[PDB]
């Protein structure tokens, strides 16, 4: 009864720095479609198994999705460090969610480079878990006061990806959706 098609079978996925929230509840959710889709290549799940969650049911089915370069699909795991893992989207510790990813090279790429998907490269601090930062202002490397101009120490933070149909076996952009099943002691707990 939960529209799992819209989150899974959509058309436009935003970039990692503009990852899309998708809150979902108030249904009965069927997982057999996720059981044996025969197309996901990296179905991995932490804390709670998906073969046996059918009995139990809470709220907080917080789940999101984006598109990301293939290799770093391993870097999305609690207690794991990396460039995008630290710097664009980082899981907390004590995980309870469930990661799913699959290849979509056939459609989300155009010869010559599809310059639409970008990702942050640096940040002064390191982000807290499950928080979003979107900001396009310049980076001031050194002691030069920079207001709105680009220079030897003023650099554009956001950088564009490179997607090719004939890219490397990890260089194609995969689609990633991660679900996260939690609970709260408050009443009015809608099941699934």
């Amino acid at each position, epitope marked *: *009864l939960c*529209p799992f*098609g*819209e989150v899974f*079978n*959509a*058309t*436009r996925f935003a970039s990692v720095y503009a990852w899309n929230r998708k809150r979902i509840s108030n249904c009965v959710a069927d997982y057999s479609v996720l059981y044996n889709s025969a197309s996901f290549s990296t179905f991995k799940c932490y804390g709670v198994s998906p073969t046996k969650l059918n009995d139990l049911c809470f709220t907080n089915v917080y789940a999101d999705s984006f598109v990301i370069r293939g290799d770093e699909v391993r870097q999305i795991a609690p207690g794991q460090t990396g460039k995008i893992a630290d710097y664009n989207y980082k899981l907390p510790d004590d995980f309870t969610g469930c990661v799913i990813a699959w290849n979509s090279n*056939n*459609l989300d790429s155009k010869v010559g480079g599809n310059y639409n998907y970008l990702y942050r490269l640096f940040r002064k601090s390191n982000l807290k878990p499950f928080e979003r930062d979107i900001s396009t202002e310049i980076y001031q490397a050194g002691s030069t006061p920079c207001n709105g101009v680009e220079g030897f120490n003023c650099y554009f933070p956001l950088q564009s990806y490179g997607f090719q149909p004939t890219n490397g076996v990890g260089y194609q952009p995969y689609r990633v959706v991660v679900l996260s099943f939690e609970l709260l002691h408050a009443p009015a707990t809608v099941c699934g």
Partner: antibody, heavy 127, light 108 residues
Framework: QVQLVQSGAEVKKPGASVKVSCKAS????????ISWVRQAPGQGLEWMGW????????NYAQKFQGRVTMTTDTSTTTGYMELRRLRSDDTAVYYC????????????????????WGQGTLVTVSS | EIVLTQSPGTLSLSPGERATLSCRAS???????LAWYQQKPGQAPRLLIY???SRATGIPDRFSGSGSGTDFTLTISRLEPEDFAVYYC????????FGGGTKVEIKR
């Protein structure tokens, strides 16, 4: 295997309004949207409209704002369309179908489209 | 919006051949927002191809789809004496616009 049923052919006089119905069965009616498409005799199809099934917010065609009204009822799992200001040039065939292009929950484009249709309905009007 | 003309309006072919319908627009379009529908005479339309490469439930394996950019192709491969109908290429990238229809007829 889902079933779609429409009413019979209708005859009108100019200046009137026409109400038609579509009945769906064999699937969760609250999980997909409804699409209405017409075809003139001997000519190609043209899109009337799409309507969600949970939020009630819909999406009409750009050219038909002031003539058509769309309604759905979850209790009997039915979808009715009322077309106003009919003229003698509107004699045609209509079709109701299940959408797989605009999600019936949030309303974003997906992969696929009008999967199962009805039996078609014939409408005529003259002086 | 987007203009769409399949052309030619008649693709009369002898039975036992291959059919390659071509659908074309003006601007560019996604490869995942277009479909191909079938229309038997005196009979309701049906879904044939969605996603420009996939197939629906209970579809004979003779039907395939390909193309990209602004040009798309539907391949029938095997033409049986049941597959004579009016076919439509349809887009839904921006709003939705239907094609002009194509008629396949028996040569003699």
């Amino acid at each position: 295997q889902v079933q779609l049923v429409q009413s019979g052919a209708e005859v009108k006089k100019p200046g009137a309004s026409v109400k038609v119905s579509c009945k769906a069965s064999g699937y969760p009616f609250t999980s997909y949207g409804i699409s209405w498409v017409r075809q003139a005799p001997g000519q190609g199809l043209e899109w009337m409209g799409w309507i969600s099934t949970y939020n009630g917010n819909t999406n009409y065609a750009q050219k038909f704002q002031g003539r058509v009204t769309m309604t759905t009822d979850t209790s009997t799992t039915t979808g009715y369309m009322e077309l106003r200001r009919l003229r003698s040039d509107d004699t045609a065939v209509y079709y109701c179908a299940r959408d797989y292009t605009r999600g019936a929950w949030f309303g974003e484009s997906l992969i696929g489209g009008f999967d199962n249709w009805g039996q078609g309905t014939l409408v005529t009007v003259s002086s | 919006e987007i203009v769409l003309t399949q052309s030619p309006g008649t693709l009369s072919l002898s039975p036992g051949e291959r059919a390659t319908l071509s659908c074309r627009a003006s601007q560019t379009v996604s490869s995942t927002s277009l479909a191909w529908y079938q229309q038997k005479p005196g009979q309701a339309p049906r879904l044939l191809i969605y996603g420009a490469s996939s197939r629906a439930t209970g579809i004979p394996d003779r039907f395939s789809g390909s193309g990209s950019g602004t040009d798309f192709t539907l391949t029938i491969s095997r033409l049986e004496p049941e597959d004579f109908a009016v076919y439509y290429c349809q887009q839904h990238d921006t709003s939705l616009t239907f094609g002009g229809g194509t008629k396949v007829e028996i040569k003699r």
